[PDB]
Amino acid sequence: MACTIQKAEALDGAHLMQILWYDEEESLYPAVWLRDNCPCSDCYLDSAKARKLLVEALDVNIGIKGLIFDRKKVYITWPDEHYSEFQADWLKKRCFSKQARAKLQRELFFPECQYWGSELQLPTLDFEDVLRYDEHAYKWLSTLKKVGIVRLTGASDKPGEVSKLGKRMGFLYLTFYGHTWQVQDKIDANNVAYTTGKLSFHTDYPALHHPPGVQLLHCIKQTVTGGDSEIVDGFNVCQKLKKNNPQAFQILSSTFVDFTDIGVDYCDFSVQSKHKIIELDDKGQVVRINFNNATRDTIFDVPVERVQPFYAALKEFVDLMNSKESKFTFKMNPGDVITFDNWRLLHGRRSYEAGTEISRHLEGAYADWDVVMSRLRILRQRVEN
Amino acid sequence: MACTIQKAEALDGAHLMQILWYDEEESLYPAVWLRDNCPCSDCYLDSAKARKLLVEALDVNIGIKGLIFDRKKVYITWPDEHYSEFQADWLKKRCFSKQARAKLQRELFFPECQYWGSELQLPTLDFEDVLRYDEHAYKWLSTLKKVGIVRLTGASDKPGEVSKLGKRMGFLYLTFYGHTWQVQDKIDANNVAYTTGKLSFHTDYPALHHPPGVQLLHCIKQTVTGGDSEIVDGFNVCQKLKKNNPQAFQILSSTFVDFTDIGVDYCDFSVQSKHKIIELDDKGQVVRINFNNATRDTIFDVPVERVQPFYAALKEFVDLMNSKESKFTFKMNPGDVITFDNWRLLHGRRSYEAGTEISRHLEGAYADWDVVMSRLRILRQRVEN
Ligand SMILES: C[N+]1(CCCC(=O)O)CCCC1
Ligand SMILES: C[N+]1(CCCC(=O)O)CCCC1
Ligand SMILES: O=C(O)CNC(=O)C(=O)O
Ligand SMILES: O=C(O)CNC(=O)C(=O)O
Ligand SMILES: NCCCCCCN
Ligand SMILES: NCCCCCCN
Ligand SMILES: [Zn+2]
Ligand SMILES: [Zn+2]
Ligand SMILES: [Zn+2]
Ligand SMILES: [Zn+2]
Ligand SMILES: [Zn+2]
Ligand SMILES: [Zn+2]
Ligand SMILES: [Zn+2]
Ligand SMILES: [Zn+2]
């Protein structure tokens, strides 16, 4: 009844098609959009699922010349004698009502979000299961999207495990630090991460204009002298900052900060960027945090009178992250892998002691959110069918 | 005189340092920023050129406790007895005056832009020269940035040339179509590009939220039956659209359009995105065009009353691109490579005839603008030294 056609007709100077469905709901489809989306082989390349029709071929003032219909299809003639068929179910899905469009957007983009603080129960799956079973890889990526982090247990204590996860998604995101990289204390370290020091809360790689969406960290070797992990939900922290100090939130969400990274690793590099630390979409919702205090430049491209208030705002933001209500602390053991949303979470680690042999070793990599979402879309289809 | 210190002193409750330079110009440096940027080994990891100092260690209300200076250095004591030295030239570069900050930003980001229409003289360099000589690779990337396109002549007529250019920059940007991809007519084509049809003006890969910054196309085989190239300067076209039809510009710069790509190539994929076709920065300047009519979805996430005006705006934009004042047409020969700014230019090709053997073959690849800019920064330093 919902997707069965009861009536179809051209309205409003034939510039609109109205479908009355058998449940008595009505849907409206502009004629220009119908013409633009003709599925015939002249207009649409089925092997590619892509539009061949050019904007140049489209009369934006077009109207329907003739229309007949049955319960499952509409058949339209156009003014220039072009001919189109549209399926009822295809039409129903693309209904222009707010409810129908929002339902479809949810299906495409998985927007459901669960914010957390120190009460987090770390979602945990088995590593080999995720590699082997679509049901498990689906739970992995969907939970990664919703919660921002999933721990995988039972990997080996050898390099190469993040690369398996990379292939499971599709491919890893290459950067100047390599396809994968080794987190260990290094002589003449080219990054603060490659020392035994504390890492305060940061996102990785704000020196890029498109920071990595998803980060993978696999514990090969752990030390008993420190090196615990800490994470925080930046979207949760931002919400609290907006509530507690709207001025601080306004400053961090509007001030461009310069980031830098110069050195040599997989290739030689001299990287510069600008980001707002709290990055809002066109509706004022936080979509990304861009903040690593190590790679924030000495160069600061603001008028002098804005400098101290910026630092005061930043300090408030960091104090919120460190609060016992926000922060979640845990320790990785050999064989553990954490996979997390590097646009949403901030992460850190406690200092540990240096010595003459390597006491601590993580292997890490990145993936692009679009690559992850693609896999998530495919998995959902496989597991629901 | 300009970078020699005549006087240094703490002002405004000791919350500011003022430098009077020997040319009588004055510079102001907030004390919090000085403390934040202490170059000592406790605060700053020289091997990484990175800040070790935590936000947590920074007193945002700090003032200078004591200061002495000579012509080339300032020496500061802080309230907690921490001690800092700053070099005159380092200070001068980071002066908070608008002029000094703007000069430095120009140096970091190469913003100079030369807009063009049908009068374009295609910048052209030799392929092997660019691989061999820093002076030539510098001209290549700087011209790529400024003009949006450079042609390279004298490459081979074999696969593998774009990969050499990839290594020259640093590395190529992997996508679902491969590290490199072959533009040829293909049975069961997964993309309109892989047919003999016309490609109207488009940017590549708006189905990704971070479309490729730079595109490389190398002509291996060309056909005499058509297959000419066309390019247009989207930033130039956008400027003209804003002048001729502000309503059309407002619509295209504010309406989110859904893009899609589903299929199988280097991996299996189901990719979805949303973009404004004309993407403005926070100041209203165009920073990216996101438009491929083939991969624009049938799904269109707008209220019905916004649909036809969107199409009317799009048609006006495309008509401007096609105008004889805007468009530049040329034909690639075997051995030619074009490298262009895929965020700024739109490109297309004329249809050609199918047949039983491959009559036309391009190899293409992408690179990230941050990767290109990094190389550009390094080259400039090498060639100026
Ligand atoms: C790629 N690595 C992180 C980049 C963090 C940052 O420089 O923002 C380099 C050090 C370990 C992982
Ligand atoms: C990577 N390729 C372009 C993508 C153009 C697009 O699908 O937006 C796939 C066809 C040839 C190059
Ligand atoms: O070493 C750790 O526990 C965490 N490392 C990082 O956050 C990093 O390398 O960027
Ligand atoms: O084939 C050409 O001349 C141009 N090709 C494309 O724009 C493409 O493959 O995306
Ligand atoms: N069942 C309706 C079929 C209409 C076909 C029209 C061909 N021009
Ligand atoms: N030339 C000035 C050197 C000052 C050194 C001070 C050490 N605390
Ligand atoms: Zn149905
Ligand atoms: Zn058709
Ligand atoms: Zn990190
Ligand atoms: Zn290299
Ligand atoms: Zn000097
Ligand atoms: Zn110091
Ligand atoms: Zn293209
Ligand atoms: Zn694959």
Crossing angle (nearest 10°) for helices A369-384 and A134-147: 130
**Interchain proximity A272–B192, CB inside 8 Å:** no
Cα-to-centroid distance, A111 and ligand 14 (Å): 25
Q: Which amino acid is at A145?
A: K
* Kind of pairing between the strands at B16-21 and A44-45: unpaired
Chain B residues near residue A36 by CB distance under 8 angstroms? 311
List chain B domain ranges: 1-97, 98-385
Please calculate the CA angle B270-B273-B276 and round it to the nearest 5 degrees.
160
Nearest residue to B363 via CA among B325, B334, B321, B329:
B334
| Of residues B94, B304, B370, nearest to A299 (C-beta) | B94
What's the N-to-C CA distance of chain B in angstroms? 24
Nearest residue to B227 via CA among B358, B355, B360, B350:
B350
Please calculate the CA angle B364-B367-B368 and round it to the nearest 5 degrees.
155
Q: Is the CB of B199 under 6 A from ligand 4?
A: yes
Q: What is the resolution of this structure in A?
A: 1.9
- C-alpha distances out from residue A153 to A135, A140, A228, A333, Å: 17, 12, 17, 9
CB A327 within 8 A of CB A118: yes
Query: Using CA atoms, how far apart are residues B122 and B338, in angstroms rounded to an integer?
Result: 10
Strand partners, B67: B76
Residues 6+ apart with CB under 8 A from B24: B6
| Of residues A56, A174, A311, nearest to B58 (C-beta) | A311
Burial class (CB in 10 A: 0-12, 13-18, 19+), B238: buried
Query: Using CA atoms, how far apart are residues B312 and A117, in angstroms rounded to an integer?
Result: 48
Structure-block tokens of residue B214: 């730079």
For chain B, the C-alpha Rg in angstroms (whole number) is: 26
Long-range contacts of B251-257 (CB under 8 A, 24+ apart): B251/B309, B251/B310, B251/B313, B252/B276, B252/B277, B252/B278, B252/B310, B252/B313, B252/B314, B252/B317, B253/B277, B253/B278, B253/B279, B253/B280, B253/B286, B255/B302, B255/B306, B255/B310, B256/B301, B256/B302, B257/B290, B257/B296, B257/B297, B257/B300
CB A252 within 8 A of CB A313: yes
- Counting from 1 in the atom list of ligand 2, the atom nearest the Cα of B193 is 10
Residue B301: closest CA among chain A residues belongs to which residue? A101
Instruction: Spell out which residues line ligand 1, taking CB within 6 angstroms.
Output: A 177, 181, 183, 191, 193-194, 204-205, 261, 292, 295, 364
Chain A residues near residue B195 by CB distance under 8 angstroms? 45
For chain A, the C-alpha Rg in angstroms (whole number) is: 26
CB B44 within 8 A of CB B87: no
Asked whether the domain spanning B98-385 has the same topology as the one spanning B1-97, the reply is no
Neighbouring CB atoms inside 10 A of B42's CB total 11
Query: Using CA atoms, how far apart are residues A300 and A295, in angstroms rounded to an integer?
Result: 12
Ramachandran assignment for B57, one of left (phi > 0), alpha (psi -120 to 50 degrees), beta (any other): alpha
Q: Which ligand is nearest to the CA of B205?
A: 2
CB B172 within 8 A of CB B371: no
Neighbouring CB atoms inside 10 A of B119's CB total 7
Q: Which fold has domain B1-97?
A: NE0471 N-terminal domain-like (3.30.2020)
Q: A320-346: buried (b, 16+ CB within 10 Å) or exposed (e) per residue? A: bbbeeebbbeeebeebbbbbbbbbbbb
What single-letter DSSP state applies at residue B336? -
Strand partners, B7: B20
- C-alpha distances out from residue A36 to A181, A231, B272, B308, Å: 47, 47, 19, 11
Residues 6+ apart with CB under 8 A from B112: B106, B145, B146
The rounded Cα A319 to chain-centroid distance in angstroms is 26
Within 13 A of A234's CA, how many CA atoms are on the CB side?
A: 30
Please calculate the CA angle B338-B341-B342 and round it to the nearest 5 degrees.
100
CB A167 within 8 A of CB A371: no
Nearest residue to B273 via CA among A108, A280, A138:
A108
CB A269 within 8 A of CB A260: no
Nearest residue to B279 via CA among B234, B309, B324, B247:
B234
Ramachandran assignment for A160, one of left (phi > 0), alpha (psi -120 to 50 degrees), beta (any other): left
Within 13 A of B179's CA, how many CA atoms are on the CB side?
A: 13
**Phi and psi dihedrals of B18, rounded to 5?**
-110, 130
The experimental technique behind this entry is: X-ray
Query: Using CA atoms, how far apart are residues A263 and B385, in angstroms rounded to an integer?
Result: 18
Chain A residues near residue B15 by CB distance under 8 angstroms? 308
- C-alpha distances out from residue B27 to A69, A255, A303, A311, A320, Å: 76, 22, 12, 20, 34
Ligand 1, atom 5, residue with closest C-alpha: A204
Q: Which residue has the tokens 């892989």?
A: B194
- C-alpha distances out from residue A279 to A219, A276, A347, B285, Å: 31, 5, 18, 18
Query: Using CA atoms, how far apart are residues B286 and B343, in angstroms rounded to an integer?
Result: 10
* Kind of pairing between the strands at B149-153 and B124-126: parallel
Residue A49: closest CA among chain B residues belongs to which residue? B262
Neighbours of ion ligand 13 (CB under 5 A): B 204
Instruction: Name the minimum distance, in Å, from the CA of B147 to any CA of chain A.
Output: 21
Burial class (CB in 10 A: 0-12, 13-18, 19+), A19: buried
- Cα dihedral A9, A11, A15, A16 sign: negative
* Kind of pairing between the strands at B345-349 and B278-280: unpaired
Q: Which amino acid is at A98?
A: K
Residues 6+ apart with CB under 8 A from A23: A1, A2
What single-letter DSSP state applies at residue B110? -
Burial class (CB in 10 A: 0-12, 13-18, 19+), A153: middle
Residues 6+ apart with CB under 8 A from B264: B190
Nearest residue to A272 via CA among B300, B12, B380:
B380
* DSSP character string of A299-317: ---S-HHHHHHHHHHHHHH
Q: Is the CB of B349 under 6 A from ligand 4?
A: yes
What single-letter DSSP state applies at residue B24? S
Mutation target vs B (from A311, A342, A372; most B CBs, 10 A cutoff): A311
Nearest residue to B342 via CA among B280, B274, B288, B278:
B288
Q: Which fold has domain A98-385?
A: Double-stranded beta-helix (3.60.130)
Instruction: Name the minimum distance, in Å, from the CA of A46 to any CA of chain B.
Output: 9
